[PDB]
Amino acid sequence: EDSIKVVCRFRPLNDSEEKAGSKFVVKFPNNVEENCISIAGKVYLFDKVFKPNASQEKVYNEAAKSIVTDVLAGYNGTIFAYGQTSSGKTHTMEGVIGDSVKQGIIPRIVNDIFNHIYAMEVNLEFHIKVSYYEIYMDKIRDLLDVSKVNLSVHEDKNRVPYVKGATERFVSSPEDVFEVIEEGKSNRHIAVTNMNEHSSRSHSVFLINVKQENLENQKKLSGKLYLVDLAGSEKNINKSLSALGNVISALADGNKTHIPYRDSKLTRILQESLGGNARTTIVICCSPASFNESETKSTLDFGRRAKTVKNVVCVNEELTAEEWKRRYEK
Amino acid sequence: EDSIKVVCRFRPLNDSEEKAGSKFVVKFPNNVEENCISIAGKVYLFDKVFKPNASQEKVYNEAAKSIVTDVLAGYNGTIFAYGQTSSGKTHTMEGVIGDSVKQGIIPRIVNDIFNHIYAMEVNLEFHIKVSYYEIYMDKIRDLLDVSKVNLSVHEDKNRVPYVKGATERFVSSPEDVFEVIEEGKSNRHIAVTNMNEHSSRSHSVFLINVKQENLENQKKLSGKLYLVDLAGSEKVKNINKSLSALGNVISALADGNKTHIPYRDSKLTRILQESLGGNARTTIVICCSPASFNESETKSTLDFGRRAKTVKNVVCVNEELTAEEWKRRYEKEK
Ligand SMILES: Nc1ncnc2c1ncn2[C@@H]1O[C@H](COP(=O)(O)OP(=O)(O)O)[C@@H](O)[C@H]1O
Ligand SMILES: Nc1ncnc2c1ncn2[C@@H]1O[C@H](COP(=O)(O)OP(=O)(O)O)[C@@H](O)[C@H]1O
Ligand SMILES: [Mg+2]
Numbered sequence: 001e002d003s004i005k006v007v008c009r010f011r012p013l014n015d016s017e018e019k020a021g022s023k024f025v026v027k028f029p030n031n032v033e034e035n036c037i038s039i040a041g042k043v044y045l046f047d048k049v050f051k052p053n054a055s056q057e058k059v060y061n062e063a064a065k066s067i068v069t070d071v072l073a074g075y076n077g078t079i080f081a082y083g084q085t086s087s088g089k090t091h092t093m094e095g096v097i098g099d100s101v102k103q104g105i106i107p108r109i110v111n112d113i114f115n116h117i118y119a120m121e122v123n124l125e126f127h128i129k130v131s132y133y134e135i136y137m138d139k140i141r142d143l144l145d146v147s148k149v150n151l152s153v154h155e156d157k158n159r160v161p162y163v164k165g166a167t168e169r170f171v172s173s174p175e176d177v178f179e180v181i182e183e184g185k186s187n188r189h190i191a192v193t194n195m196n197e198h199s200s201r202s203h204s205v206f207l208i209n210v211k212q213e214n215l216e217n218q219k220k221l222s223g224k225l226y227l228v229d230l231a232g233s234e235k236n237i238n239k240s241l242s243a244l245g246n247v248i249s250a251l252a253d254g255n256k257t258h259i260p261y262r263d264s265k266l267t268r269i270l271q272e273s274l275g276g277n278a279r280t281t282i283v284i285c286c287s288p289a290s291f292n293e294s295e296t297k298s299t300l301d302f303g304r305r306a307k308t309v310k311n312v313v314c315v316n317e318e319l320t321a322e323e324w325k326r327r328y329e330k
Numbered sequence: 331e332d333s334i335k336v337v338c339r340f341r342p343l344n345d346s347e348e349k350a351g352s353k354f355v356v357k358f359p360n361n362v363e364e365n366c367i368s369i370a371g372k373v374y375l376f377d378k379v380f381k382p383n384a385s386q387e388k389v390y391n392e393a394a395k396s397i398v399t400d401v402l403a404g405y406n407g408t409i410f411a412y413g414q415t416s417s418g419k420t421h422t423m424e425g426v427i428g429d430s431v432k433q434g435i436i437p438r439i440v441n442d443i444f445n446h447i448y449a450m451e452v453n454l455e456f457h458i459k460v461s462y463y464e465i466y467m468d469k470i471r472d473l474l475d476v477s478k479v480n481l482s483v484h485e486d487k488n489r490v491p492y493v494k495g496a497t498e499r500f501v502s503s504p505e506d507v508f509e510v511i512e513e514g515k516s517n518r519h520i521a522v523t524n525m526n527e528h529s530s531r532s533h534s535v536f537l538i539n540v541k542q543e544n545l546e547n548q549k550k551l552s553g554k555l556y557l558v559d560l561a562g563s564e565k566v567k568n569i570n571k572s573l574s575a576l577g578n579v580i581s582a583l584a585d586g587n588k589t590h591i592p593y594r595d596s597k598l599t600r601i602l603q604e605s606l607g608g609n610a611r612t613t614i615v616i617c618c619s620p621a622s623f624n625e626s627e628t629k630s631t632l633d634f635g636r637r638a639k640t641v642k643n644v645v646c647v648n649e650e651l652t653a654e655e656w657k658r659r660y661e662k663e664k
């Protein structure tokens with residue numbers, strides 16, 4: 001009963017763009033609900049629309065709303081950034097780590113997780129593991145350990161697609177996690193000639209597995225929290241992105257059956273995120289430039305279609321076979 | 331619709347019975363179906379009736395065999411011998427272990443089982459544990475290690491009951507079990523003044539817990555085998571608190587009142603809880619002297635038989651589904 005949240009961010013018109021004679025051609029009819037864009041005769045409504053002067057913090061407050069609360073209550077949650085190259089996926093997911101104002105969703109998330117744990121009463125033992133890898137040309141390289149290239153996907157005991165053989169690092173403070181991110185960022189350069197080119201055509205996948213045990217209940221909860229910065233969505237295209245569209249499309253109205261998750265590694269990893277058991281926000285990012293009109297329009301279409309999709313979401317309680325049997329009676 | 335199976339065994343007229351001037355007071359009308367006795371001159375019917383010269387083997391095949399393939403199919407099954415002292419319980423359940431012809435139900439079941447395990451076409455990992463203990467005045471003693479008299483009875487996740495902290499010896503071959511049996515047999519002779527009296531007044535129970543994993547698809551199944559030699563059914567007050575509980579449980583199950591069943595009123599009846607009305611396939615073997623002098627005792631053994639055969643057991647395969655599988659089995663309800 002849980003619509004995928006879709007949130008739309010326009011960046012400021014930049015230089016290449018004024019000086020190549022691109023006009024700013026986007027409007028924001030309002031509202032009051034502040035959730036609407038007009039481009040060249042089309043009109044779109046989402047959960048929020050952010051204007052070029054919207055700050056990382058403001059954006060974080062909407063996009064990452066309950067997610068850390070949710071993940072700490074044992075819900076899976078995901079955020080990913082979708083749109084063409086240079087529209088601001090990385091600015092948004094990452095921004096400038098270390099800069100208070102200019103940092104993006106991931107780092108805020110990270111501080112915000114630990115602050116919540118501290119301020120938490122009830123004595124709970126947190127195991128927190130993190131992974132960081134990329135999908136490029138439908139192949140997975142672990143950024144934490146570059147000998148693990150071309151990794152494979154497999155389903156688990158619950159039949160949830162996970163990436164097998166990937167480094168999972170324990171962490172106990174923000175500084176820990178940031179050290180891991182900085183590790184991954186240089187590893188990504190290994191064998192890479194043009195990083196602008198490489199990262200615009202690959203998916204960066206950041207994963208925070210959050211296990212909690214209550215040291216009285218004996219109650220174990222769990223939450224997978226995925227932060228993803230996609231390959232650029234431009235044209236045709238980049239094939240995991242057709243897969244993403246095809247999965248989105250197949251989820252319309254109804255419909256939980258015959259869904260082409262396997263069409264790509266990406267879409268397998270994101271399986272719960274789209275239709276399954278997670279709360280999912282998507283940030284679509286857009287240029288406001290006239291030159292980018294059709295690319296913007298499709299990003300918005302994609303957005304349009306994805307808004308309508310509803311997830312099947314519950315607490316990930318960790319039970320033994322015995323308990324689950326009993327928990328069944330009426 | 332697994333009704334408990336009742337089987338009736340008469341043994342030959344014995345030496346002391348003759349000298350004391352007792353006649354054979356029992357006929358076997360044929361049948362054909364081989365299923366009835368008439369005792370001066372009231373008739374009783376059972377699943378099967380064995381004349382004084384039935385061989386061990388015949389008794390085994392015609393009353394036990396099917397239990398071996400059941401437990402291998404993951405069902406619980408139990409066999410017990412009931413009837414007055416001297417009537418042939420121990421001869422039936424045990425016989426003479428060494429002796430290929432004179433051995434009884436226990437060793438043959440054990441042979442049968444390993445053999446079937448040997449020749450299984452599909453590949454399985456089979457773990458077998460046996461337990462071996464004695465009930466005596468509602469007090470459980472472990473024959474595998476005498477450091478434990480007085481063992482508790484506990485429930486479990488499903489329901490059991492089962493006996494806490496009894497020796498469970500892992501076994502791999504018949505000789506493995508035969509040794510364990512010889513272990514409990516000499517370990518019984520001690521803490522005990524006369525054996526015959528003690529024997530006659532106690533229940534001996536043998537459990538074979540039979541666990542299996544299908545290596546190919548990891549499908550898991552379990553089975554318990556209770557092989558019980560009861561105390562003599564005679565008040566000869568002088569009757570047994572466990573036998574009486576047995577009579578009452580069966581009595582309860584023979585009318586319509588469930589609502590309530592006296593299981594708790596004895597340890598014995600708690601162990602045999604699934605065997606009686608619960609989730610196991612149960613065969614009872616009533617043993618009888620054919621001597622005129624025993625006519626009364628014989629008849630109550632018969633009547634107990636006649637009441638037990640009408641009990642219905644409520645059985646299903648003991649599948650051990652994993653956690654994940656149960657989780658969804660519960661989307662059924664909610
Ligand atoms: N909302 C924004 N405000 C200011 N500058 C931005 C914004 N979004 C993107 N930029 C700038 O645009 C350039 C490209 O953005 P980037 O996030 O790398 O695009 P993408 O990762 O989607 O290809 C970078 O200089 C970035 O800092
Ligand atoms: N079917 C039978 N055929 C021949 N002898 C038997 C048979 N059943 C019992 N006996 C003999 O009669 C005696 C009583 O056997 P037993 O099983 O000890 O009685 P109980 O019911 O007290 O255990 C033993 O000496 C045994 O060898
Ligand atoms: Mg990029």
Ligand SMILES: [Mg+2]
Nearest residue numbers: 419420529530
């Ligand atoms: Mg005896």
